[PDB]
Each structure stands twice: as structure tokens, then as C-alpha cells.
Write a protein that binds this DNA or RNA. Structure first.
Ligand SMILES: [Mg+2]
Ligand SMILES: [Mg+2]
Ligand SMILES: [Mg+2]
Ligand SMILES: [Mg+2]
Lengths: 112, 48, 102, 154, 116, 49, 145
RNA sequence: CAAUGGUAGGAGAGCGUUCUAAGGGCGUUGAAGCAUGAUCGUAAGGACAUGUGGAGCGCUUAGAAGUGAGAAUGCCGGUGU
RNA sequence: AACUUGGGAGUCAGAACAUGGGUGAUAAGGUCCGUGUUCGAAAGGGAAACAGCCCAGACCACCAGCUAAGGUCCCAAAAUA
RNA sequence: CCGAUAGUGAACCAGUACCGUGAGGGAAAGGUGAAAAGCACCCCGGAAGGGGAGUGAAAUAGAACCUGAAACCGUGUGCUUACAAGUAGUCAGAGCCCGUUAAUGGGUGAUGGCGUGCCUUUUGUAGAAUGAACCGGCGAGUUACGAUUUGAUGCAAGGUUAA
């Protein structure tokens, strides 16, 4: 009834991916894929990938159909941040936090 | 020219109410049935 | 059928069949407490006791002698390092009226 | 703050930086710094007057003679070390799990026999100590040790 | 023997965070501000447990005053009349008598109007 | 007397006064030394006489 | 917390009342009307809910004034602009827009709380014998002097 | 029957943390921690139940202390705006 | 209550009002003394708000009662006495 | 006596990264499981990841691996909120949901009353005096010897040892 797919430590800031995941929340699988493939943002290819993984998992493990599949819920939360520095002026150094993201998507057949 | 105080979580989430991406202008393609952007050429088929 | 009694340091208006909460008394569970300080018996037959209405008593069964919920007294004075925390629990009684007199 | 490695340089200048004024990286507030007033090597022993030391041995031996825990035995006579036999003796004498056995002078075989019975300590009549009489719930004194302990402690 | 201050600071701070359950924003997740707000709350409560006694007193006054003027008589005269008559009913009990039993309130108003 | 029930002589022992631990003890902030001056400093005070 | 009645909106009944102003001084009418619509004459008064009645004032141009505040008693009002202060005397209000005169004298006698505004909205002042509120069935009310 | 605001400050009684001695106990049939809860005492605080957790830990009396943090433009580490 | 002896202190920046005086200008929320009070170290009611003014000293409840200073047409409890 | 912000600077390739021309200065960093049994195959993906199946007592024990708090970031929602002037609480209270360590119960709160954080320093601070972004850990009257005084305990014209 539910199928899971997760991408961990994706090299995109979670607040940047969340903008895109605020569109495919609760839409149908086909419409969701059409959005991702056409939204011109950076995170979009990495999330489309997760949707295909989720649908493949559903078909191959639960033998449920990929037409009545709505996106039960899809979110993204922080990951193991990488700390770097930028040489700024007058000998001072400022920090740069290269963040990451733990993308999760679950697709459901809307039943029990 | 520096923040005199913190911007609480309430104020933060409030300011970004209008900060969002719009769903693409997508319509279904007449030759293949896959979605395409309106006024653009379908990338799956290559039509109109 | 409707009367007003004076118990502890306060007054209460009562009609038989009700549960009430008053200061602690010295009677035990299940006993009967009778008040002799009645000041007004109203309703269909009104009796305006000057201090009290003479003769009218009010009898009620006693149950659940207990302690109120813990109010936590706290106070402090700023910039003085002075503060005090004390907990308190007033005792009380649950009384149920079962008869009235006139 | 004197025994922690290094820490001799004023970590930054006193004024101008916007930081708190610091003088060593080994000050007590610093991670890795000197301890203020902690443990120091010392002894803990004290002394009491001599007469008071004697009233304490007598008081412990009188508590263990009011509670009926003083069994005077005549002699001991163990001619070779054997533990199973010392357990038989203390059980036939009905002595509690914790007993203190007192010999006259050093009795090697009695000592080697009760070293492993868990709950039994063997002591000479001169080496009687309060902590030992007071832990022991029962005593077993040789008649010769009993006359020696009466002579010394009174 | 060293002793490390674990597992005591935790409980002490948590039983104030929990005691600030339901305060706006950052006042219900931080010890350093939750404690101040709880202190202030205790102070306010200690004052209000006194203020209540007088707020409800004047509530009963307003109700009795409204009730008396329906009988063409003012609160001051009403209370003076009951004092003369010897009646010792609280302001609270007059409030509920006026709300519930109009006939009885009228009757004791007359007994007070006649105690002039 | 048993080693697990012992009692010290009445009034013979007393817990010492720890200083500078909370306001409630009564010696909280200044540790009983007042506010300022030599008396309020470490190794302060004045030589006797 | 024993037994004091508290009015709530399932038991509040509000009535309508017309109070004529022909021959009644501003303050001595406005204070009484404010007491009315506050509900301080309801034996079932409650401070935290809007008990109290509706009020209509019909004439509102036959107001008289004591002393000579016909020319004095100037009302001021500011527009939050620099030097944005202009003023008007009481007589000019009484001849031009007399409804506002009474509607502003009474609302000054109520609190500024939210209940204050919702109570002041229970007032309808008209400047001439006729009122357009006959459907709410109003009852003449006399003033206790 | 009387007394009980309180700062510098004096006096007294106590609550808690680690360790030790002894006694008596609890623990894979689930310890310590952690989280939740509408529980108990005058306070410092003490329990109980349910989850996670996968091995130690309470209680009584008495001893010792690296024993209690919210501020030092404190130090270290995380994470904000 | 007071005094004596002994153990432990903190205090040596005061403030405003009223009243007797100096100084200044019968100036100052001035300054220096004397004599109260209060604040300091004092919450509560009044003075719109307002450490020092007026009234009054908070052990902890209570949806009881009486009053002081201030008050009683509305904001806002009490006299449109 | 310390149990990884402790105890050596260093429990771990440490006087090592690193810093400085050099004297010198100097870190951070332990913990899968009993056993490596360290995940055969299948599925999406270029891969990183993942989802099944299997190993194991346990895999939110999967190698960054025991427990896994708070700050902080999200996803749901029960109750609220778009005429209002708010040191954010308290006190009074309708409406709406829920039901316990069953006790005169829990969550939210229309609307009214009262109400300018905390510390330090001051005669006096809501102060626009100072101090703290926030969480966590660490972080300050101790010890040795001697003097004085009080309590306690010996025993007393005697008491007492030091090496
Ligand atoms: Mg450069
Ligand atoms: Mg400030
Ligand atoms: Mg400011
Ligand atoms: Mg600052």
C-alpha cells in the first residue's frame, strides 16, 4: 500500500530542494514526473530519480499498479554538512557551509 | 547597519510566505501524450 | 427547598441534592453534618433570617475529606537575590445535602 | 595552572581585539587548563589519647560479650593445614557466618586453615583491633589468649 | 574522588521547561528564558490570588447596584437598610438571590426599605 | 555496636559551611565578604596589627 | 471559584431603547446612555462579555449646553501630518453633523478595549425625530435624573 | 497566647551528586541512561507506569569530597539569525 | 528590655520630603550641619503614570466581612445624597 | 586517584597535523557485533544512494556502526487567528476537541482585569548604564602546617607523648 524511496547525503542545500518538493506533495505519479522533468531547477533531476526509484520499488516488491499512485508525502531534511572557508580581506577568513539533504518520498495506492 | 536583534522563527517563516516556485506551465502534447511546456517543442517527440 | 448557610468564614447557597466544598471540618467519612447557622430560606416560602432564621437547620452527608490542588507560592525581588518558593494545599470537604429544615 | 604543559604566552593582546582578556591557555576556565584546589597528596591519619584507645578495645569486647558472641575454647591443636576441618569446627561450635578467631601467639596451622573460609579472619591476642572485633558477629578465643587479653587490656 | 555534574542539570532544567508548557515561541524551549518567565508567572499569580478577592467583590457590588435600582433604591441605602434590619447576607448571596429569586429579593428589599 | 548501625556522639560532629553555592544558603554571590575593598579580594585583608 | 454566575452568549438577551434628547444636556445624557449600553443596569452583568442593550437617539439636534461652550469647547483632531491639526467648535458640530457630536461624546465614555468598540457599535444617533429602525421594535426609555 | 517583609550580614535545619565501610537488596522474566505522563512532600526534590536500552544499580547507617552554574565582552563543541 | 564576657561579621558613595540654621541669589532635583520620617533593605491602597509624598508593614489559602488615605456622573466599586 | 572537554600534550602512528625564518608554539581525534557472521541474489540508478530478500538476539547494531539529550531543521494535523497598539504572563472565563498517575481531569482559548525581562552596579536602573545569539559540557573559599574559640570525648592535680 506504501512504497518507500530515499536518497541520502544529496549535495544540495535542504531548503533549496524543499522548494521543489512543495509542488509534488499529494499529486499523481504521472503529473508529478511531468512537473519535475519540466521545472527548471537544480534539485529536480535528483528528485525525479527518487520518484522512479519509488515506483520501481512499488512495482517490483508490492505488485501494485503505477497509475492510481498518489504521492502520500515527500519531504527533505538536513544532512551531514561539510565545513569550508573563503579567504576574505585583511587576513580574515569567513566560513562556507556546503549543506546536504536527506530526500524521502513515499507513494501510496490510497487504501489499506 | 547590523541586525539589532534576532529574527524569530515566527518572523522568518512569515517573511518567506511568498517565497516559492510556481508549478511549470505544462500542457499535454498532442502527438505523444507526455507533458510539455506550452509554446515549446516537445522534447520526447519533437512536434510543433 | 432553597436556603443559605454560613460555614467556615463564608456563606453558601444550597438546595438539597447538590455537592459542596467548604473549609475543613472535624467530622469523618460518611457522617452527617448539620449546620445551625442558616440566614435565608428562599424559593416558594421565603424566610429572611435577621442574623439567622431561628430553627432552620441544614443537614448533609459528608464524604471525601481531602486536600485541594497544590498551588505553588513563588515570589522574588529583582536585583536583590531574594526569592521564596512554598507549596500549599488547602483542606476541604465534599458535602452532599440530603434535607432542609424551616 | 603551573603543572599543565606549556601555557606561558599571553594568548592575544589585552586591548583591541573584542575578545575577553586572557593570560594563559592553561587557566582554569579553559578546556585543558589547570585545576583549582583539587586533590593533593596527603595522609588522613590522626591519634587519640592512649587511655581512650584501651576503653575502645574493652568496649568492643564487652559488646561481643553482652550479645553472647564470645566462645572460649580451650586450645586449638591443628597439626597440619586443612580447610575442610576448620569448617567442621566452626559449624560444630555453631558460629555465625562471620567469626573472628583469636589464638595465643601466632598459630600457623589455624591461620593457614581459615584464610580461605569466606568470612573468617585469624588474629593474635596482641593484634586485636576494634574494626575486626566489631565486624565479627562471634568470637572464639583460646583460654591462653583469654588470660593474655585480660592481663594486657586491664 | 571527582564527581561530574551529569544527570542533575538535565532534570532541573527539564522540570522548568515542562513547567513553561504553552508559552509563546522561544519561551517554551529554552531554559535561560523559560526560568525567567516562570519566575514572573509565580509573581503574577501571587498578586492575582489577592486581586481576585476584590474583583469578584466589586462584581457583586455592580450586580446588587443594578438590582436595587429596579426597585427605585440605591446600593448605599440598600446596604444601610440591611445593616439597620440586622440582616447579615454577603454581597455574593445578594447577587445570586437577585439573579435567581426575584420575589425574595423584592421581599428583603422591602424589609430593608422599612428598616429606614 | 554494629558496624552498619553506628551513630556518632551527639553534637560531636557538624557539617561545614560551603561558600558561594547558590543564594538560598545565604552566602551565595559575594561569599560573605561584602562588595568591594581589600576584604572582598583573594589573598586580601590586611596584615594583623 | 465557587458559584458566581457568568453570562455567556446562549443566555444574553439584548433589547432596543429610544432615548430622546430634546432638552437634555450632553454629558448628563451621554453618561447615562453609556451606562445603558455597557449593561451596568442588567442584574446579570458580566465584565468579559457584551451584555447590555442597544440605544437609539432621535433628536440629537435639540441638545442644550450650559455656560457658554457654544463658542468654547473646541474639539481637536490630528491627521498624523506635520502641522496637521485642525479644530472645530461645538456649535458648528451641533448645526453641521450633530449625530457625530453625540456619537463621539458617548464613545469617549466607554473603554478602548475591543469590547469597548463592539459596545459602541450598538449606538445609532439620528438628528431629527425619525429613526429608520422600527423593525427592531424599540421602546421609549426615560432618563433617571 | 504571641511572633513570621527584608539587602551587606550572623545563626540553624535540611535536599541533592560521586566514592568508600558494613548490613540488606534489585537486575536479559531487562540495570544505568534517555523520553513521555493528568503523581507525592513545606522547598531543595522523591516515586510509580509506559516506550527506547542491552548491563549493571538501588535502599539503611556512617564516613570522605574535583558536590550543585545563568551571566566572568568566560573556554571547547554543535546550531541558528 | 538592659548590661558584662566571648565567637562571626558587613558598614566608612547615601537619597528625598518636613522642619531649625549656615553657604548661594529668603537660586537649584545645589551644597554643608541639626531633628523626625520614608526609600535604601518595603510589597499593598491613593497621588494618571511616578525609590523618597499620604495611608499602611505581605507566614500560606478563601468567588467571606469591616475600614485608613483617597473618593462616589461615565471610563472606574461607591451619593446624579 | 581520572575514566576520553577527565586523566599525560599525546589511550588513536603525538611533540605528530599545523603555525613560525627561527628559537619555539602546538592540537582535534577511543567504543558495530558474541562471532565478521561485513548484507549471496533481485529491483531503480552512470554512480552515490536506496527498497526487498538473507546474516544476527537486535541492522533506526550496516561499517561516519553502543546508548543518542538540547539548540536547530522538517512533515502531518486537534484548537485557534486577517479592526488590531501586545516584557507576551497571570487572573476571570464562554465555545470547540480529548479522556488520566480519576482528580473537584487534559489540550486550545473569543473576550475582560492586572502587569515595563534577568543579572551586575548603584542614593536611585524597564533602563537608551554593564553582561549574555542559542543549546550542551567544563568553569571559583580547597589543602598542609600553627594560633584562637565553641561543641564533643577520655581523665583530672595531673594530662600527654615526639622521633
Ligand atoms: Mg594576504
Ligand atoms: Mg540592556
Ligand atoms: Mg530599548
Ligand atoms: Mg552584548
Amino acid at each position: 500500500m506504501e512504497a518507500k524511496a530515499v536518497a541520502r547525503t544529496i549535495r544540495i542545500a535542504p531548503r533549496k530542494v524543499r522548494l521543489v518538493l512543495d509542488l509534488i506533495r499529494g499529486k499523481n505519479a504521472a503529473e508529478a514526473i511531468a512537473i519535475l522533468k519540466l521545472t527548471n531547477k537544480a534539485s529536480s533531476p535528483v528528485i525525479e530519480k527518487v520518484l522512479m526509484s519509488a515506483l520501481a520499488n512499488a512495482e517490483h516488491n508490492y505488485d501494485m499498479n503505477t497509475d492510481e499512485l498518489v504521492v502520500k508525502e515527500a519531504y527533505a531534511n538536513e544532512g551531514p554538512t561539510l565545513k569550508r572557508f573563503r579567504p576574505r580581506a585583511q587576513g580574515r577568513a569567513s566560513a562556507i557551509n556546503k549543506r546536504t539533504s536527506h530526500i524521502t518520498i513515499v507513494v501510496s495506492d490510497g487504501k489499506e | 547597519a547590523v541586525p539589532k536583534r534576532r529574527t524569530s522563527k515566527t518572523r522568518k517563516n512569515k517573511r518567506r510566505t511568498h517565497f516559492k516556485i510556481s508549478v511549470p506551465g505544462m500542457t499535454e502534447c498532442p502527438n505523444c501524450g507526455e507533458y510539455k511546456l506550452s509554446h515549446r517543442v516537445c522534447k520526447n517527440c519533437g512536434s510543433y | 427547598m432553597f436556603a443559605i448557610i454560613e460555614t467556615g468564614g463564608k456563606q453558601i447557597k444550597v438546595e438539597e441534592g447538590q455537592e459542596i466544598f467548604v473549609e475543613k471540618l472535624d467530622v469523618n467519612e460518611g457522617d452527617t453534618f448539620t449546620f445551625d447557622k442558616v440566614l435565608f430560606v428562599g424559593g416558594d416560602s421565603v424566610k429572611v433570617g435577621a442574623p439567622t432564621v431561628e430553627g432552620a437547620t441544614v443537614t448533609a452527608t459528608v464524604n471525601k475529606q481531602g486536600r485541594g490542588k497544590k498551588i505553588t507560592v513563588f515570589t522574588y525581588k529583582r536585583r536583590k537575590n531574594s526569592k521564596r518558593k512554598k507549596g500549599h494545599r488547602q483542606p476541604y470537604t465534599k458535602l452532599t445535602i440530603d434535607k432542609i429544615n424551616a | 595552572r603551573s603543572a599543565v604543559s606549556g601555557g606561558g604566552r599571553k594568548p592575544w593582546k589585552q586591548k583591541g581585539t573584542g575578545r575577553a582578556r586572557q593570560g594563559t591557555i592553561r587557566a582554569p576556565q579553559w578546556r585543558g587548563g589547570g585545576i583549582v584546589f583539587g586533590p593533593t597528596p596527603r595522609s588522613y591519619a590522626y591519634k587519640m589519647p592512649k587511655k581512650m584507645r584501651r576503653l575502645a578495645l574493652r568496649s568492643a569486647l564487652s559488646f561481643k560479650a553482652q550479645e553472647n558472641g564470645l566462645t572460649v575454647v580451650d586450645a586449638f591443636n591443628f597439626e597440619a593445614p586443612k580447610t575442610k576441618e576448620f569448617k567442621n569446627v566452626l559449624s560444630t561450635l555453631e558460629q555465625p557466618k562471620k567469626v573472628l578467631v583469636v589464638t595465643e601467639n601466632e598459630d600457623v596451622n589455624v591461620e593457614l586453615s581459615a584464610r580461605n573460609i569466606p568470612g573468617v579472619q585469624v588474629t593474635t591476642a596482641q593484634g586485636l583491633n576494634v574494626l575486626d572485633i566489631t565486624n565479627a558477629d562471634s568470637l572464639v578465643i583460646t583460654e591462653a589468649a583469654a588470660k593474655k587479653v585480660e592481663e594486657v587490656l586491664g | 574522588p571527582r564527581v561530574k555534574g551529569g544527570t542533575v542539570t538535565r532534570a532541573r532544567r527539564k522540570k522548568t521547561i515542562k513547567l513553561a508548557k504553552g508559552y509563546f515561541g522561544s519561551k517554551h524551549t529554552l531554559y535561560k528564558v523559560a526560568k525567567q518567565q516562570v519566575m514572573k508567572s509565580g509573581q503574577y499569580a501571587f498578586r492575582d490570588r489577592r486581586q481576585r478577592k476584590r474583583d469578584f467583590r466589586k462584581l457583586w457590588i455592580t450586580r446588587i447596584n443594578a438590582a436595587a435600582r429596579q426597585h427605585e433604591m440605591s446600593y448605599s441605602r440598600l446596604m444601610n437598610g440591611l445593616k439597620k434590619a440586622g440582616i447579615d447576607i454577603n454581597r455574593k448571596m445578594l447577587s445570586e438571590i437577585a439573579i435567581s429569586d426575584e420575589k425574595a429579593f423584592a421581599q428583603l428589599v422591602t424589609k430593608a426599605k422599612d428598616a429606614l | 555496636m554494629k558496624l552498619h548501625e553506628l551513630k556518632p556522639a551527639e553534637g560531636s560532629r557538624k557539617e561545614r559551611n560551603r561558600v558561594g553555592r547558590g543564594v538560598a544558603t545565604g552566602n551565595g554571590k559575594t561569599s560573605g565578604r561584602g562588595h568591594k575593598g581589600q576584604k572582598a579580594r583573594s589573598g586580601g585583608g590586611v596584615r594583623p596589627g | 471559584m465557587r458559584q458566581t454566575f457568568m453570562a455567556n452568549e446562549s443566555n444574553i438577551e439584548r433589547k432596543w431603547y429610544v432615548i430622546d434628547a430634546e432638552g437634555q444636556t450632553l454629558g448628563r445624557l451621554s453618561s447615562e446612555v453609556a451606562s445603558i449600553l455597557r449593561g451596568k443596569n442588567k442584574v446579570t452583568y458580566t465584565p468579559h462579555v457584551d451584555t447590555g442593550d442597544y440605544v437609539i437617539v432621535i433628536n440629537a439636534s435639540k441638545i442644550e449646553f450650559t455656560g457658554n461652550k457654544e463658542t468654547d469647547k473646541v474639539y481637536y483632531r490630528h491627521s498624523n501630518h506635520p502641522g496637521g491639526i485642525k479644530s472645530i467648535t461645538a456649535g458648528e458640530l451641533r448645526r453641521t453633523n450633530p449625530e457625530r457630536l453625540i456619537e463621539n461624546s458617548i464613545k469617549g465614555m466607554l473603554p478602548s478595549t475591543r469590547l469597548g468598540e463592539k459596545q459602541g457599535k450598538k449606538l445609532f444617533v439620528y438628528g431629527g425625530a425619525e429613526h429608520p429602525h422600527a423593525a427592531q421594535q424599540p421602546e421609549n426609555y426615560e432618563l433617571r435624573g
